[PDB]
Symmetry: D2
Subunit: 256 residues, 4 copies
C-alpha cells in the first residue's frame, strides 16, 4: 500500500477520473478528501465514493468547492487539515471541456474555462503547496491535463491552452517547490469514456472510429488513470517531478 | 521582399521583439499596423518606428490597444481595415513577464498576466482570423511564445502557462483555420536581451551564467526574431502550420 | 507485490540502473533474468545480485549476452524459456556512454555505441516480443532511454541518437504490439550517479554544478529508477503505452 | 537572395525533397553541389537539376556518393572545395524507408536503414562540420528527419529511430559546433507526395484518407520543403540552432 498515511486532496471527484483516483488512493491506504462541484450531483457522487471507501475499511471526507472560485483551494486544505491534520497530495482534476467553434467563441464561455481549468487550478496548487511547505515533509502534486496539451483540437481552442498551461504550471512549480520536496507532475489521459466525451460517444458513429485509433484496441475508463496517479503520488516516484505521463493506450504515437 | 501585398498587425511593437519584427516586415514590403500599450512611452516608440520605416519607403500606422482589453482585437482589425483595407498577417507579440515567486503570487498580478498574454491573444487571433476568413484569401498567424513553453521558470509560474497556452492555441487554431488557408505558428524565443529582463539580467554575475548556457555564445537581440517571424509569415512557409520554431541559440538543447 | 506471476528479462543488470531495477522487480515477486556483459566483472555482479535476491525469497538466473551481438536476443529469450517457461516483461537497459568529442569520433567507437544501445536493443525487443505474442497473454517492454533523448550532449553526439532512437522505437513498437496486449514505454532518467559517469562527475567542481541544476537538490541513484520501471511494468500502467517518463528530479524543466 | 555566395551540399538530391531543396538554393544565389545515389537514376536526375539550374543563370555540380558508404561525406566536401572552394551549408537529406513489419524484420534490412539514414548521416555531418570549423566563417547544417521523429509507425520500427536519431544528432551537434558558428537544425516534413510514399498513394484508396488528416487540405510536395530548408540555411535564422521545424500542413497537431 503506497499512501498508508498520506492524506490526498482530489478535486472534482464526483465522477470520472477524479472519482476513480480518490477510490484507488483509499485502497492504497490514503486518507482521502473527496472534493466536488458543490452541486447536488457532486454531493451525491462524493458521498457514494465516501461510503464505498469505508465499505472496504478506508476513510474519507466529502467537501464541496467550486474550482472557478479561487478560494476553494485554501478551503479544501482547511477541510483536510481539520479532518486529517496534513496536506500531502493534491490531484487537481477539476475541469470542463464545452466543445465549441473558435471564430464564434463567446467571451464568457472562454473565460469560464480559463478560470475553471487554469486560474482555479493555479490557486488550488498554491494553497496546497504552502501547506506542504510549512509541513516540511514534502509532498506530491498531480495535475490532470490532456493529450491535447501536446496536440490541437478544432473545437477546443479555448480548452487546449488551459491543458497545456496545466502542464507548464507543473513544470515551473517543480522548480519553485523542488527544494521543499514537493514534486509536481501531470497526467495526460487520452480518450477516456467519461461524461466529457459522452456527447461524442452517445452518437456511437465514430466511437468505432475513436477505438480504431487507439493501439490498445479499447477506449479509456477512469480506473485507467488511477494507477498512474497514485504512482506519481507515491515513493515509487520520489525522483519524478516536472514530468508528464501519457495515459492514452498509444493514441498519441499512432499517426495515421 | 516577401510581404509585398500583405498587411501585418503586430501587437506590442512599441519596443522589443515587436518593434524589430514590425520593422523587418515593412522592409519586406508589408503594410504594418504597430499596436502598442496606449502609453505615451508606447505611442512614442510606435510613432518613432512609424517614422523610421517611413524614412526608407515603408508604410505603417499606430493603434493604441490594451491587450488585456479584449475589445482591442476588433479595434486593431478595424484600424487596419479603415486604413489599409485588409489584414493578412497577425503577429501576436504583446506580453508581460513580471517576475514574482509562486507561493506569494497576488491574484491581481496573476490575472493580469493571463489576461494580457493569453486571453487578449485569443480574441486578438479570433478577430484577425474572422477578417482573413471573410476575405477568403488565406493568411498567417504568428504567436510569440517562448522557450518557457517547453520548460519551467521558478519566478514565472504565472508566465509560462500563458506562453505554453499560446503554443497550444496555435495548434488548435491551425486545425480550425487550416481549411481556410490560414496558417498559425508559434515562435519560441530563448533569452533575448530586452526590457522584459533588464533588471533580471543586470546581476552582471548571472548574465554570463545564462550566456554560457547558449551554445551560440551570446544572448538574443530582437533582430534575431525578425527573420524567423517573416519566414513563418511568408510563402516560404506555405506548408508550415501548427508548428513551433525555437529561436534560442541552442539554449533549449544545451544540457549543461 | 505487483509482478507476482511475471518473468522479467533485464539486460545490463550486473551494475547500475539495471541491477536496482532487477532487484526491485524480484521483490515485487518477479522471476528475474539478469543478463550481463559476459564479463567476469559482470558475471560476478549478476551472480551476486542473484544471490542477493535469493536471500529474501526471490528467484533469478544470470545469462551472459553481449548486446552488440544481436543473437543475444534469442539467447536471453531461450534462457528465460528453458528455466522459467515464459517472458512477460523486458527491461532493455544495456547501454554504453563513452564520452568523446564529435569531430574526432572514431568510426569503430561510434558503431559500438549504436550497435550496443540501439541495434542490439531492437532485436532484443523483437525477440522478447515474439515470445509475448506466441504466448498471447500480453506483456510489457521498458527501454531505459534518457533525458538526453529530448536534449543534446556535446560529448554525446554518438550517444544521444541511440537513446532518442530508443524512445522512437518504443513509440513505433507500441503501435505494432498494442493489439497483442504488449505495452512498450521508455523511462528517461536524468543525471544518475553510476559508473557511466564516475570519471565525468569526479571533477568535484562540476558535480555540484549539475547538482544545483536539479530542483530536487540531488543527483539520481539507481534506486530512483526502480519505482518507475516496475510501475510501467505493472498493471498500474494498464492503459500506458507509447509513453515516456522523465525521472530526473526536475532537471529537464529547470531552465536555470 | 539568401545564399548569394554560400555553397550548399545537398545529399540524395536526385528526386524528392533533396532535388527541390538544391534548386531553390540556386534560385537564392547558392553554389549548389547536387549529391546523389551514384546510380543511373541519381546521375540522370542530378544532371537534370544541374542543367535546369544553369538555365536561369545558376551554377551547380553533380557528384555521386553512397550515403551508406561512410566515406561519402569527405568526398562530397572534397568535391565542393575543389569546385567552389568552401563548404557552408549541408542538407543531409539522403535516406530510405522500406516499409516492413517488425517481428519479422531482417537483420540486413534494419542495418541497411540504420547505416543509410543515421550512420551515413553522422559522418557526412562530421566531414562537413570540420570544413566549416577550419573555414572559421560559420555555417548551417540541416538534417531532413521526419514527423515520425515525434510519433510512431507500425511498419517503421526500423525507420523512426533513425529519424529521431537525426533530430537528436542536430541537438547535440548544435552544442558541440555552437561556439564555431555552425548552426544545426532539422526539418520534419509530414506526408510528402514523393517516391517513398508512392506505394501507398499508388493505391489511391487511403490517399483520400491521407489528405483528410492534413488541415491544409492537401498533401505535401517537395517544394514545400524548399522554403523552410533555405530559411534554416540563411541569415534569417542566425540565432536558430538545435531546433526542429514541422513542415506538415498541420498533420501532427490534427488529432483524431
Ligand atoms: N474526457 C477525456 O477523455 C479527458 C482527456 C484528457 C483530460 N481530461 C481532463 O480530466 C479531467 C476530468 O474530466 P472527466 O473526463 O473525468 O469528465 P467529467 O465530466 O466527469 O469531469 C470531472 C469532474 O470535473 C468536475 N467539475 C467541473 N467543473 C467543476 C468546477 N468548477 N468545480 C469543481 N468541480 C468541477 C465535475 O463536477 C466532475 O466531477 C478534466 O479536467 C478533463 O479536462 C479529460
Ligand atoms: N526577451 C525574452 O527573453 C523573451 C523570452 C521569451 C518570450 N518573450 C516574449 O516576446 C514577446 C516580445 O516582448 P519582449 O519581452 O521581447 O520586449 P519588451 O518586454 O521590452 O516589450 C513587450 C511589448 O509588449 C507591449 N505590451 C505590454 N503589455 C501590453 C498590454 N497590456 N497591451 C498592449 N501591449 C502591451 C509593450 O508595448 C511592449 O512593446 C513577449 O510577449 C514575451 O512574452 C520574450
Ligand atoms: N546514469 C546516468 O546518468 C544515465 C543517464 C541517462 C541514461 N542512462 C542509461 O541507463 C542505463 C543503465 O546503465 P547505467 O549507465 O545507469 O549504469 P552503468 O553504466 O554502470 O552500467 C551499464 C550496464 O550496461 C551493461 N552493458 C554495457 N555494455 C554491454 C554490452 N555490450 N552487452 C551487454 N551488457 C552491457 C553493463 O553490464 C552494465 O551493467 C544505460 O543504458 C544508460 O544509457 C544512464
Ligand atoms: N516520404 C515522406 O513524406 C517523408 C517524410 C518525412 C521524412 N522523409 C525523409 O526525406 C528524405 C527524402 O525522401 P523523399 O521523400 O524525397 O523520397 P525519395 O525516394 O525521393 O528519396 C530521396 C533521395 O534519397 C536518395 N537515396 C536513398 N538512398 C541513398 C543512398 N544510400 N545514398 C545516396 N542517396 C540515397 C535517393 O536516391 C533519393 O534521391 C528521406 O530521408 C525521408 O526519410 C520523407
Amino acid at each position: 500500500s503506497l499512501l498508508i498515511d498520506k492524506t490526498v486532496i482530489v478535486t472534482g471527484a464526483s465522477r470520472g477520473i477524479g472519482r476513480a483516483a480518490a477510490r484507488e488512493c483509499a485502497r492504497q491506504g490514503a486518507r482521502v478528501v473527496i472534493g466536488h462541484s458543490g452541486s447536488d450531483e457532486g454531493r451525491a457522487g462524493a458521498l457514494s465514493l465516501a461510503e464505498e471507501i469505508a465499505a472496504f475499511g478506508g476513510t474519507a471526507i466529502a467537501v464541496g468547492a467550486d474550482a472557478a472560485d479561487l478560494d476553494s483551494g485554501e478551503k479544501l486544505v482547511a477541510a483536510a487539515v481539520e479532518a486529517f491534520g496534513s496536506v500531502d497530495v493534491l490531484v487537481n482534476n477539476a475541469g470542463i471541456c464545452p466543445f465549441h467553434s473558435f471564430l464564434d467563441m463567446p467571451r464568457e464561455l472562454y473565460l469560464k474555462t480559463v478560470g475553471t481549468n487554469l486560474n482555479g487550478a493555479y490557486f488550488t496548487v498554491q494553497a496546497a503547496a504552502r501547506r506542504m511547505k510549512e509541513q516540511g515533509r514534502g509532498g506530491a502534486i498531480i495535475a490532470v491535463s490532456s493529450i491535447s496539451a501536446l496536440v490541437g483540437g478544432a473545437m477546443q481552442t479555448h480548452y487546449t491552452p488551459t491543458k497545456a498551461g496545466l502542464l507548464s504550471l507543473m513544470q515551473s512549480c517543480a522548480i519553485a517547490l523542488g527544494p521543499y520536496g514537493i514534486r509536481c507532475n501531470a497526467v495526460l489521459p487520452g480518450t477516456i469514456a467519461t461524461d466529457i466525451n459522452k456527447e461524442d460517444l452517445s452518437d456511437l458513429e465514430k466511437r468505432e472510429r475513436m477505438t480504431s485509433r487507439v493501439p490498445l484496441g479499447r477506449l479509456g475508463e477512469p480506473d485507467d488513470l488511477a494507477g498512474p496517479i497514485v504512482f506519481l503520488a507515491s515513493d515509487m516516484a520520489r525522483y519524478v517531478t516536472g514530468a508528464s505521463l501519457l495515459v492514452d493506450g498509444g493514441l498519441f504515437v499512432n499517426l495515421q
